[PDB]
Amino acid sequence: QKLFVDKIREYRTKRQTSGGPVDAGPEYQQDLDRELFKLKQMYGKADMNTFPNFTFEDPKFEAVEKPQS
Amino acid sequence: VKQASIKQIQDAIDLEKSQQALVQKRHYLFDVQRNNIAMALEVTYRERLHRVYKEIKNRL
């Protein structure tokens, strides 16, 4: 369990990292940006803080001349 | 003369029946036309009502 305790210590040290998910990873920023761009492209254009408002109209059937008794 | 008389009376009878159908047909069709006018109007508000919630849910 002592090896497991050492693993727990390493996990705790990673937890206390002030930079959080930095890990000294130069490609972490690039990978995160690529993932975000892919997610945005898949979901399409959107706004982080906005509401959906729209209006529409429907024209009924136009009158057609028809004479009869 | 008998043939002439029977032809006249049957002509009168069939004209009476034709007018009996004719008087009914006009208002019978007009009522259904008015009813269909209401039918055409139904689906207006449903489109917006259904789409707005879907758009907001997609935003979330």
CSV table of N, CA, C and O in Angstrom, one decimal, chain B:
chain,number,residue,atom,x,y,z
B,1,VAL,N,-102.2,13.8,-77.8
B,1,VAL,CA,-102.5,14.7,-76.7
B,1,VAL,C,-102.1,14.2,-75.4
B,1,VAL,O,-101.6,14.9,-74.5
B,2,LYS,N,-102.4,12.9,-75.2
B,2,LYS,CA,-102.0,12.2,-73.9
B,2,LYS,C,-100.5,12.3,-73.7
B,2,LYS,O,-100.0,12.6,-72.6
B,3,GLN,N,-99.7,12.0,-74.8
B,3,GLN,CA,-98.2,12.0,-74.7
B,3,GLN,C,-97.8,13.5,-74.4
B,3,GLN,O,-96.9,13.7,-73.6
B,4,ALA,N,-98.4,14.4,-75.1
B,4,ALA,CA,-98.0,15.8,-74.8
B,4,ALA,C,-98.3,16.2,-73.3
B,4,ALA,O,-97.4,16.8,-72.7
B,5,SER,N,-99.4,15.8,-72.8
B,5,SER,CA,-99.8,16.1,-71.4
B,5,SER,C,-98.8,15.5,-70.4
B,5,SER,O,-98.3,16.1,-69.5
B,6,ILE,N,-98.5,14.2,-70.6
B,6,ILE,CA,-97.6,13.5,-69.7
B,6,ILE,C,-96.2,14.1,-69.8
B,6,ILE,O,-95.5,14.2,-68.8
B,7,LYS,N,-95.8,14.4,-71.0
B,7,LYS,CA,-94.5,15.1,-71.2
B,7,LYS,C,-94.4,16.4,-70.4
B,7,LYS,O,-93.4,16.7,-69.8
B,8,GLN,N,-95.5,17.2,-70.5
B,8,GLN,CA,-95.5,18.5,-69.8
B,8,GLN,C,-95.4,18.3,-68.3
B,8,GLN,O,-94.6,18.9,-67.6
B,9,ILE,N,-96.2,17.3,-67.8
B,9,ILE,CA,-96.2,17.1,-66.3
B,9,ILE,C,-94.9,16.6,-65.8
B,9,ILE,O,-94.4,17.0,-64.8
B,10,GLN,N,-94.3,15.6,-66.6
B,10,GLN,CA,-93.0,15.1,-66.2
B,10,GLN,C,-91.9,16.2,-66.3
B,10,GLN,O,-91.0,16.2,-65.4
B,11,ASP,N,-92.0,17.1,-67.3
B,11,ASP,CA,-91.0,18.2,-67.4
B,11,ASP,C,-91.2,19.1,-66.1
B,11,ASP,O,-90.1,19.5,-65.6
B,12,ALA,N,-92.4,19.4,-65.8
B,12,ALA,CA,-92.6,20.2,-64.6
B,12,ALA,C,-92.0,19.6,-63.3
B,12,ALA,O,-91.4,20.2,-62.5
B,13,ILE,N,-92.3,18.3,-63.2
B,13,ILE,CA,-91.8,17.5,-62.0
B,13,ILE,C,-90.3,17.6,-61.9
B,13,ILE,O,-89.7,17.8,-60.9
B,14,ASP,N,-89.6,17.3,-63.1
B,14,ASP,CA,-88.1,17.2,-63.0
B,14,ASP,C,-87.5,18.6,-62.8
B,14,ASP,O,-86.5,18.7,-62.2
B,15,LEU,N,-88.2,19.6,-63.4
B,15,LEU,CA,-87.7,21.0,-63.1
B,15,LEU,C,-87.8,21.3,-61.6
B,15,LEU,O,-86.9,22.0,-61.0
B,16,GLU,N,-88.9,20.9,-61.0
B,16,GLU,CA,-89.1,21.1,-59.6
B,16,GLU,C,-88.0,20.4,-58.8
B,16,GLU,O,-87.4,21.0,-57.8
B,17,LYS,N,-87.7,19.2,-59.1
B,17,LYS,CA,-86.7,18.4,-58.4
B,17,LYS,C,-85.3,19.1,-58.6
B,17,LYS,O,-84.5,19.2,-57.6
B,18,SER,N,-85.0,19.6,-59.8
B,18,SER,CA,-83.8,20.2,-60.1
B,18,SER,C,-83.6,21.5,-59.2
B,18,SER,O,-82.5,21.7,-58.7
B,19,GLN,N,-84.7,22.3,-59.2
B,19,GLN,CA,-84.6,23.5,-58.3
B,19,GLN,C,-84.5,23.1,-56.9
B,19,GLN,O,-83.8,23.9,-56.1
B,20,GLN,N,-85.1,22.0,-56.4
B,20,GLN,CA,-85.0,21.6,-55.0
B,20,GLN,C,-83.5,21.3,-54.7
B,20,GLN,O,-83.1,21.6,-53.6
B,21,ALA,N,-82.8,20.6,-55.6
B,21,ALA,CA,-81.4,20.4,-55.4
B,21,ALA,C,-80.6,21.7,-55.4
B,21,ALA,O,-79.7,21.9,-54.6
B,22,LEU,N,-80.9,22.6,-56.4
B,22,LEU,CA,-80.2,23.8,-56.6
B,22,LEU,C,-80.2,24.7,-55.4
B,22,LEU,O,-79.2,25.3,-55.0
B,23,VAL,N,-81.4,24.8,-54.8
B,23,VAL,CA,-81.5,25.7,-53.6
B,23,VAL,C,-80.6,25.3,-52.5
B,23,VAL,O,-80.1,26.1,-51.7
B,24,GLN,N,-80.5,23.9,-52.3
B,24,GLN,CA,-79.7,23.4,-51.2
B,24,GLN,C,-78.2,23.6,-51.5
B,24,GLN,O,-77.5,23.9,-50.6
B,25,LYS,N,-77.8,23.3,-52.7
B,25,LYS,CA,-76.4,23.1,-53.0
B,25,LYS,C,-75.6,24.4,-52.7
B,25,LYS,O,-74.4,24.2,-52.1
B,26,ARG,N,-76.1,25.6,-53.0
B,26,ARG,CA,-75.3,26.8,-52.8
B,26,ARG,C,-74.9,27.0,-51.3
B,26,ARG,O,-73.7,27.2,-51.0
B,27,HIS,N,-75.9,27.0,-50.4
B,27,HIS,CA,-75.5,27.2,-49.0
B,27,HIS,C,-74.8,26.0,-48.4
B,27,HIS,O,-73.9,26.1,-47.6
B,28,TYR,N,-75.1,24.8,-48.9
B,28,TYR,CA,-74.3,23.6,-48.5
B,28,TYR,C,-72.8,23.7,-48.8
B,28,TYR,O,-72.0,23.4,-48.0
B,29,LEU,N,-72.5,24.2,-50.0
B,29,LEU,CA,-71.1,24.4,-50.3
B,29,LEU,C,-70.5,25.7,-49.6
B,29,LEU,O,-69.3,25.7,-49.2
B,30,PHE,N,-71.3,26.7,-49.4
B,30,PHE,CA,-70.8,27.9,-48.8
B,30,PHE,C,-70.4,27.7,-47.3
B,30,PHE,O,-69.4,28.2,-46.8
B,31,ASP,N,-71.2,26.9,-46.6
B,31,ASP,CA,-70.9,26.5,-45.2
B,31,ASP,C,-69.5,25.8,-45.1
B,31,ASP,O,-68.7,26.2,-44.3
B,32,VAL,N,-69.3,24.9,-46.0
B,32,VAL,CA,-68.0,24.1,-46.0
B,32,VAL,C,-66.8,25.1,-46.4
B,32,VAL,O,-65.7,24.9,-45.9
B,33,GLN,N,-67.1,26.0,-47.3
B,33,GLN,CA,-66.0,26.9,-47.7
B,33,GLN,C,-65.7,27.8,-46.5
B,33,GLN,O,-64.5,28.0,-46.2
B,34,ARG,N,-66.7,28.3,-45.7
B,34,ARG,CA,-66.4,29.0,-44.5
B,34,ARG,C,-65.6,28.2,-43.5
B,34,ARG,O,-64.7,28.7,-42.8
B,35,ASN,N,-66.0,26.9,-43.3
B,35,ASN,CA,-65.3,26.1,-42.4
B,35,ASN,C,-63.9,25.9,-42.8
B,35,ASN,O,-63.0,25.9,-41.9
B,36,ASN,N,-63.6,25.7,-44.1
B,36,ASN,CA,-62.2,25.5,-44.5
B,36,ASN,C,-61.4,26.7,-44.4
B,36,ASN,O,-60.2,26.7,-44.1
B,37,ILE,N,-62.0,27.9,-44.5
B,37,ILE,CA,-61.3,29.2,-44.2
B,37,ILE,C,-60.7,29.1,-42.8
B,37,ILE,O,-59.6,29.5,-42.6
B,38,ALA,N,-61.5,28.7,-41.8
B,38,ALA,CA,-61.0,28.5,-40.4
B,38,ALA,C,-59.9,27.5,-40.4
B,38,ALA,O,-58.9,27.6,-39.6
B,39,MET,N,-60.0,26.4,-41.2
B,39,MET,CA,-59.0,25.4,-41.2
B,39,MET,C,-57.6,25.9,-41.6
B,39,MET,O,-56.6,25.5,-41.1
B,40,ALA,N,-57.6,26.8,-42.6
B,40,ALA,CA,-56.4,27.3,-43.1
B,40,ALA,C,-55.6,28.1,-42.1
B,40,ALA,O,-54.4,28.3,-42.2
B,41,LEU,N,-56.3,28.7,-41.1
B,41,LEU,CA,-55.7,29.6,-40.1
B,41,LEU,C,-55.0,29.0,-39.0
B,41,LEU,O,-54.3,29.6,-38.2
B,42,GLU,N,-55.1,27.6,-38.8
B,42,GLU,CA,-54.8,27.0,-37.5
B,42,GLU,C,-53.3,27.1,-37.2
B,42,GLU,O,-52.9,27.4,-36.1
B,43,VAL,N,-52.4,26.7,-38.2
B,43,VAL,CA,-51.1,26.3,-37.9
B,43,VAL,C,-50.1,27.5,-37.6
B,43,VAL,O,-48.9,27.3,-37.6
B,44,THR,N,-50.6,28.7,-37.5
B,44,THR,CA,-49.8,29.9,-37.4
B,44,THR,C,-48.9,29.9,-36.2
B,44,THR,O,-47.7,29.8,-36.3
B,45,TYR,N,-49.5,30.1,-35.0
B,45,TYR,CA,-48.8,30.3,-33.8
B,45,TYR,C,-47.9,29.1,-33.4
B,45,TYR,O,-46.9,29.2,-32.6
B,46,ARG,N,-48.3,27.9,-33.8
B,46,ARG,CA,-47.7,26.7,-33.4
B,46,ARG,C,-46.2,26.7,-33.8
B,46,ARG,O,-45.3,26.2,-33.0
B,47,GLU,N,-45.9,27.2,-35.0
B,47,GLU,CA,-44.5,27.2,-35.5
B,47,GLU,C,-43.6,27.9,-34.5
B,47,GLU,O,-42.6,27.4,-34.1
B,48,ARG,N,-43.9,29.2,-34.2
B,48,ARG,CA,-43.1,30.0,-33.3
B,48,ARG,C,-43.1,29.4,-31.9
B,48,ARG,O,-42.0,29.3,-31.3
B,49,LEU,N,-44.2,28.9,-31.4
B,49,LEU,CA,-44.2,28.4,-30.1
B,49,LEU,C,-43.3,27.2,-30.0
B,49,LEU,O,-42.6,27.0,-29.0
B,50,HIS,N,-43.3,26.3,-31.0
B,50,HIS,CA,-42.4,25.1,-30.9
B,50,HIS,C,-41.0,25.4,-31.2
B,50,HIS,O,-40.1,24.8,-30.6
B,51,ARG,N,-40.7,26.4,-32.0
B,51,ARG,CA,-39.3,26.7,-32.4
B,51,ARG,C,-38.6,27.5,-31.3
B,51,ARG,O,-37.3,27.3,-31.2
B,52,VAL,N,-39.2,28.4,-30.6
B,52,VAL,CA,-38.5,29.2,-29.6
B,52,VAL,C,-37.9,28.4,-28.5
B,52,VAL,O,-36.7,28.6,-28.2
B,53,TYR,N,-38.6,27.4,-28.0
B,53,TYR,CA,-38.1,26.6,-26.9
B,53,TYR,C,-37.0,25.7,-27.4
B,53,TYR,O,-36.0,25.5,-26.7
B,54,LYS,N,-37.1,25.2,-28.6
B,54,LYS,CA,-36.0,24.4,-29.2
B,54,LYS,C,-34.7,25.2,-29.3
B,54,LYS,O,-33.6,24.8,-29.0
B,55,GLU,N,-34.9,26.5,-29.8
B,55,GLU,CA,-33.7,27.4,-29.9
B,55,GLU,C,-33.1,27.7,-28.6
B,55,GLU,O,-31.8,27.6,-28.5
B,56,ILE,N,-33.9,28.0,-27.6
B,56,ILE,CA,-33.3,28.3,-26.3
B,56,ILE,C,-32.6,27.0,-25.7
B,56,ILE,O,-31.5,27.1,-25.1
B,57,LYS,N,-33.2,25.9,-25.8
B,57,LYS,CA,-32.6,24.6,-25.3
B,57,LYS,C,-31.3,24.3,-26.1
B,57,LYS,O,-30.4,23.9,-25.4
B,58,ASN,N,-31.3,24.6,-27.4
B,58,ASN,CA,-30.0,24.4,-28.1
B,58,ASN,C,-28.9,25.4,-27.6
B,58,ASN,O,-27.8,25.1,-27.4
B,59,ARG,N,-29.3,26.7,-27.3
B,59,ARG,CA,-28.4,27.6,-26.7
B,59,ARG,C,-27.8,27.1,-25.4
B,59,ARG,O,-26.6,27.2,-25.2
B,60,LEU,N,-28.7,26.6,-24.5
B,60,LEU,CA,-28.2,26.0,-23.3
B,60,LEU,C,-27.3,24.8,-23.5
B,60,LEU,O,-26.2,24.7,-22.9
